[PDB]
Amino acid sequence: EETRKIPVPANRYTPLKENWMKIFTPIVEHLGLQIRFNLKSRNVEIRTCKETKDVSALTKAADFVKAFILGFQVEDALALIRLDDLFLESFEITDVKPLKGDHLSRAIGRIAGKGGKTKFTIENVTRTRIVLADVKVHILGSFQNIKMARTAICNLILGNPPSKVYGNIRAVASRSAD
Amino acid sequence: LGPQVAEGENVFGVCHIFASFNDTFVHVTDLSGKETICRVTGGMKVKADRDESSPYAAMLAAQDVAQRCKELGITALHIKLRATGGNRTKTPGPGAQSALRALARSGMKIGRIEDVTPIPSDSTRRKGGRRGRRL
Amino acid sequence: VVADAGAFLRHAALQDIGKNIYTIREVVTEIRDKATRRRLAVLPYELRFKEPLPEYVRLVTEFSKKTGDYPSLSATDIQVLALTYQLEAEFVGVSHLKQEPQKVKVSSSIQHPETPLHISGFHLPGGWITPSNIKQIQQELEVRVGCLTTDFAMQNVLLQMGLHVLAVNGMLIREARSYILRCHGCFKTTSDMSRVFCSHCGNKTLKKVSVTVSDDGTLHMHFSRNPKVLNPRGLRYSLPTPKGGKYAINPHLTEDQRFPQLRLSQKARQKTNVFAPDYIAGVSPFVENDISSRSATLQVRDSTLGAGRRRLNPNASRKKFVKKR
Amino acid sequence: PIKLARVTKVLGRTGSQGQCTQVRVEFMDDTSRSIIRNVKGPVREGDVLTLLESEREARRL
Amino acid sequence: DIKLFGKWSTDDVQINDISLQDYIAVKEKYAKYLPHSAGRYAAKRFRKAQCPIVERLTNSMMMHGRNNGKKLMTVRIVKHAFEIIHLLTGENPLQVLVNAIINSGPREDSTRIGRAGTVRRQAVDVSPLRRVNQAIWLLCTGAREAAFRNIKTIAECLADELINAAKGSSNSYAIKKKDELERVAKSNR
Ligand SMILES: [Zn+2]
Numbered sequence: 001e002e003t004r005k006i007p008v009p010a011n012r013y014t015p016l017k018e019n020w021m022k023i024f025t026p027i028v029e030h031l032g033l034q035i036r037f038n039l040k041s042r043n044v045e046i047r048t049c050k051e052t053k054d055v056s057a058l059t060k061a062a063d064f065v066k067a068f069i070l071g072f073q074v075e076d077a078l079a080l081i082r083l084d085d086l087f088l089e090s091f092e093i094t095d096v097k098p099l100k101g102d103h104l105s106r107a108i109g110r111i112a113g114k115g116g117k118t119k120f121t122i123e124n125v126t127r128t129r130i131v132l133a134d135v136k137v138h139i140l141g142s143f144q145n146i147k148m149a150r151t152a153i154c155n156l157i158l159g160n161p162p163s164k165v166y167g168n169i170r171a172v173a174s175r176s177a178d
Numbered sequence: 179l180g181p182q183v184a185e186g187e188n189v190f191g192v193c194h195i196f197a198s199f200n201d202t203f204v205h206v207t208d209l210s211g212k213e214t215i216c217r218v219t220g221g222m223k224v225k226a227d228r229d230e231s232s233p234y235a236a237m238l239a240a241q242d243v244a245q246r247c248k249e250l251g252i253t254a255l256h257i258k259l260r261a262t263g264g265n266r267t268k269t270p271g272p273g274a275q276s277a278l279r280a281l282a283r284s285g286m287k288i289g290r291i292e293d294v295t296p297i298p299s300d301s302t303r304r305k306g307g308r309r310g311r312r313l
Numbered sequence: 314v315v316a317d318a319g320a321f322l323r324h325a326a327l328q329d330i331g332k333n334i335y336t337i338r339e340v341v342t343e344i345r346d347k348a349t350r351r352r353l354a355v356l357p358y359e360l361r362f363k364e365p366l367p368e369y370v371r372l373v374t375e376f377s378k379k380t381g382d383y384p385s386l387s388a389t390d391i392q393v394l395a396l397t398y399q400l401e402a403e404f405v406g407v408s409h410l411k412q413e414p415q416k417v418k419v420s421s422s423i424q425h426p427e428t429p430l431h432i433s434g435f436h437l438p439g440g441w442i443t444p445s446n447i448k449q450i451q452q453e454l455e456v457r458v459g460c461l462t463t464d465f466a467m468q469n470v471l472l473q474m475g476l477h478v479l480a481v482n483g484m485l486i487r488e489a490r491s492y493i494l495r496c497h498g499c500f501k502t503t504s505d506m507s508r509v510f511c512s513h514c515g516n517k518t519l520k521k522v523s524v525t526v527s528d529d530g531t532l533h534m535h536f537s538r539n540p541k542v543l544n545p546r547g548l549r550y551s552l553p554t555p556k557g558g559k560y561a562i563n564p565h566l567t568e569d570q571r572f573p574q575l576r577l578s579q580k581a582r583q584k585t586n587v588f589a590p591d592y593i594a595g596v597s598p599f600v601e602n603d604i605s606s607r608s609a610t611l612q613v614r615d616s617t618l619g620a621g622r623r624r625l626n627p628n629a630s631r632k633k634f635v636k637k638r
Numbered sequence: 639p640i641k642l643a644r645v646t647k648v649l650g651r652t653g654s655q656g657q658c659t660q661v662r663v664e665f666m667d668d669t670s671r672s673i674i675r676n677v678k679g680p681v682r683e684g685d686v687l688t689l690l691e692s693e694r695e696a697r698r699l
Numbered sequence: 700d701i702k703l704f705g706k707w708s709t710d711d712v713q714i715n716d717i718s719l720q721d722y723i724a725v726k727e728k729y730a731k732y733l734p735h736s737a738g739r740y741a742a743k744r745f746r747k748a749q750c751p752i753v754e755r756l757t758n759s760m761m762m763h764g765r766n767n768g769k770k771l772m773t774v775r776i777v778k779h780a781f782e783i784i785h786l787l788t789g790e791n792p793l794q795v796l797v798n799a800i801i802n803s804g805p806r807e808d809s810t811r812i813g814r815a816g817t818v819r820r821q822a823v824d825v826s827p828l829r830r831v832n833q834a835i836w837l838l839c840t841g842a843r844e845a846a847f848r849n850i851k852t853i854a855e856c857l858a859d860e861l862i863n864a865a866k867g868s869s870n871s872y873a874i875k876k877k878d879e880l881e882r883v884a885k886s887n888r
Contacts, residue, residue, distance in 0.1 A: 002288055014621060017429065024434055024442050026588075034441045037434050051444040056282040063275075078587045079598045083699070086598065087233065087272035095267050097310040105634040115612040120602040127597040141598070142699075143233055143272055151313055158310035178596075593698050594649050594660060594674055642718060654811050658823055676821070678808050679829025682745060686718040687824055690807050690881075694888075 003047040004062045008037075012069050016044075022074045023065065026081055031057040044069070063088065070138050071131035080140070089146045090138040097158045107157040108132065118162045122152050125169045127178075148172055180251020188254040188287055191215055191247065196260040197274035199267070201230040204243045204277055206255065216246040220273065233276030240280035247286075254287035263296035265304045270295070314479075315397045316340075316360070317390075319463030321349045325481040333404075333458060334360040335396060339389045369395040369402070380414055380473050384512050385466035385504035393460075394467060401458050401476055414473040414530060421536035426521035431490070455486045465491045466504035472526045487528040494519035495534075497543065510568035517566075547626020560611065575613045578606040582615065612638060642666040643675075643687035652676065652697070660696065663687060674698055701730045703753060703793065704778050711791045716801050718827050722748045723797055734774045748828055752796065753777060755831075759839045760857075776854045783858035792861075799864035803873040804834035807884045822884040834873065838864060841872030 008016055016023070016037070024035045027046065034047040044065050048058055060081055067077035067088055080086050093099070099107055111132055112119050119130055126149040128141030139149045152169045156162065181189050194205040201220030207213065220235035221227075223242065229235060247255070257278060259270045270293065282288060304311070314331030318340050328334060344350060373395045377383040386394075401410070429435045433450045434442050442450070452463075459479040462468060468489050471478055479485045494503045499514040502522070511519050520542060523535040552564055559573050581603035586592070603609050622637060631637060644664035652660050658676045665671050666686075674696045677687070702708060709730040714720040734753040740746050747755070760766075760773040784792035809820035825833075838860055845856035863871035869878075 004291065017432075020432070020434055025447075028442055028444055028447060032444050034443050035434065036436050036439070036441050039429070039435055039437050047441070049443055055285070056279060059279055059282045073584070075585050075587060076599060079585070082587045082592070083598060085233070085699075087275055089272050090269045091267050096306070096312045098304060098308065102634070105632075109634060115609065117604055117609065120604050123599070124601055124604060127599065129599060146272065154310075154312045591647070591649065596697075596699070598699065654813055654815075654817070658810055658812075659826075675824055676810075677824040677826055678810055679826030679832075680745065681826045681828075684721075685827055686721070687827070688716065688718045688806050689824065690885075 005043040027061045191252040193255040197271040202236040202273035236273040236277040237280035240277040244284035256289035314459045316461040320461035365395045369399045382466045417532045490525040495522040550627040779854035780858040800834045804830035837873035
């Protein structure tokens with residue numbers, strides 16, 4: 001029996017505690033994996049028991065809990081539980097353009113937009129989920145959808161206004177046999 | 179052909195899964211890492227440069243390596259994930275995840291999942307200019 | 314063997330263990346969940362409805378005001394408690410029961426009220442959630458008449474009297490530990506964990522205090538001797554002038570002040586469920602967001618959202634380019 | 639090889655002009671293999687299909 | 700016992716394909732004396748599946764504009780075609796009709812997906828009701844172009860088309876059109 005341990009930061013302890021039943025129930029019910037949260041090591045531990053139905057379910061659960069810790073909602077990583085062709089690609093915001101200080105903050109703003117609206121628009125077009133950590137961007141979706149979302153985000157964080165980005169991603173989504 | 183091990187104990191290799199931003203390498207080596215066992219790229223399974231970094235090529239690569247390691251007697255693998263690192267991005271891509279899952283399906287016991295990406299302490303200059311990178 | 318709403322809400326298939334299955338009509342008519350109402354139309358009908366005469370209701374009321382749980386219970390809870398009291402009086406001798414319950418003793422520790430003890434998954438230094446423990450992790454598990462109650466306040470007053478209680482498990486419960494909220498202004502305790510304003514003085518001042526009740530009838534309260542709990546750090550700050558209209562959001566100073574109606578649209582408040590049998594037919598893995606409604610432009614958010622933002626003290630430094638809604 | 643089918647649930651009307659019906663399919667081979675398929679024409683709950691080839695899956699996701 | 704045209708038995712009719720069994724409505728309660736019934740059959744969706752299949756063949760025989768209202772002519776042509784079928788084959792002509800409908804209807808067909816301009820077609824399955832309808836339509840159309848300018852009466856040509864489709868040979872218009880449609884659908888996928 002093998003196990004996987006994944007860490008949790010201090011800012012994700014309370015979301016883990018509130019959503020704990022919605023996390024451990026799908027892992028143990030139909031995947032059949034033991035789960036605990038070590039408070040000393042601050043780790044979510046997932047284990048294979050005799051009740052595990054099939055191999056690689058523990059990898060599925062590990063991706064689910066890792067996606068929840070990175071900042072995604074519990075149902076958007078339950079999508080990683082159910083679907084097979086889903087991945088979790090992430091990058092830093094300074095990876096494409098060296099931005100210092102206030103400029104960097106403005107880049108973060110034009111991933112969000114007003115009220116988060118711009119971000120949601122990309123999530124509507126690329127069919128992905130984007131999480132903005134403090135200087136990090138995480139995309140959950142299919143491989144081509146991750147490519148479209150990262151193209152939109154990289155276009156946003158090197159200077160393009162949101163309307164041009166919307167038009168470009170709508171043209172690409174029309175061309176992508178969606 | 180392989181180690182003379184009883185059925186209870188497993189033979190451990192170290193699988194370096196390096197997902198560059200153009201293809202993916204599956205490099206099973208010794209515990210020392212000096213003597214290799216198997217390696218298939220994203221490019222030796224799909225005949226297109228467009229789909230070189232695709233998760234399809236990575237998963238086919240992982241099945242090929244898993245079959246080869248079953249042939250040579252290695253039954254379990256430690257995992258050392260990698261991105262390009264240095265000035266470049268540090269997170270292993272979806273191809274590395276696809277290869278890891280595909281070798282997890284293919285009867286392999288998994289050991290330790292550990293990320294060795296060459297994070298610089300204090301890097302040199304980025305390959306792109308001041309204007310930016312990646313469209 | 315009386316059944317509360319928590320028995321049918323948690324799907325207690327416990328009609329076999331008992332024979333005096335008595336329920337009120339208001340405990341079975343107030344249930345809004347469709348699955349258990351469908352279950353009630355399928356379940357074997359051995360339950361019978363019975364209404365209590367009100368001398369027992371009167372007596373349950375005067376010691377409910379003495380046990381400190383009268384604001385915590387509701388009227389139908391009083392009806393169920395009077396029902397089990399009057400059947401214990403009707404079948405069993407009444408002299409077994411003591412009235413005017415005992416005094417609570419104080420024993421405080423240095424543990425924070427937010428320490429995650431007695432949570433099934435969490436483990437300090439083994440505590441594992443396994444497929445063989447899911448049906449058993451409900452609560453702390455320990456002859457003719459009984460109860461099927463999960464609400465703590467009824468259990469607290471009921472073991473203060475001395476009737477044996479049971480749950481959807483088989484064996485009866487001797488010890489009940491849980492949490493209550495205590496006001497540190499007026500020292501009135503509430504068993505309702507959802508509320509944030511106390512009923513007596515109306516201030517936003519309830520704090521968690523742990524309680525343990527024995528089968529003998531002893532209540533004892535564990536306080537926290539931690540100065541972090543009673544620290545007045547982010548409590549005084551400048552408030553804006555009161556504003557009215559359709560879009561004003563006031564800083565929520567009282568429990569019953571009239572807020573303007575700002576609801577999320579139904580497209581905005583749909584979360585995707587992934588285990589639906591028709592989920593795979595969908596064109597997208599996730600529910601489409603709301604970007605077109607007027608509630609999206611007004612930045613209306615759910616009530617449960619942004620809880621840790623409210624917990625930061627207002628006299629502190631946020632990041633330079635952010636605005637806190 | 640040709641294998642006959644079953645209808646479990648009618649899912650919706652898709653297509654360019656709304657001419658195809660997306661529908662769930664159960665198998666007559668005593669298996670619980672349900673596949674989503676697109677059909678042309680009117681179908682209802684209680685129909686029996688004739689799949690010329692059954693390895694094909696419709697537009698899932 | 701109920702006999703079509705007073706002579707033709709209906710209990711000998713057997714359905715080979717069970718997917719079309721619940722729609723080819725000929726067997727027991729749906730057998731009538733005459734193809735003419737004039738019942739409200741298009742009032743509600745799927746009600747035409749309850750219709751006797753000889754009435755369906757009659758109703759799809761008046762399609763062309765100069766014969767667009769004459770039904771007694773179509774039922775006497777159906778009677779004559781059944782006579783021709785019975786003297787040629789020797790079997791029950793109802794069985795020949797059912798076999799022709801079974802062997803005539805296409806099982807999969809191409810369709811257009813996307814928007815206006817998408818010139819690639821996806822192959823989809825064909826509904827059993829649509830399969831029966833298109834089989835009847837193709838059989839009647841084969842009877843039409845089989846007898847436009849020739850000495851042969853259309854009853855004889857309808858009987859010939861029905862027999863050629865029941866035998867499955869590559870002489871019926873319906874069989875050729877079904878083969879073309881299935882080949883196009885297999886090429887598209
Ligand atoms: Zn108070």
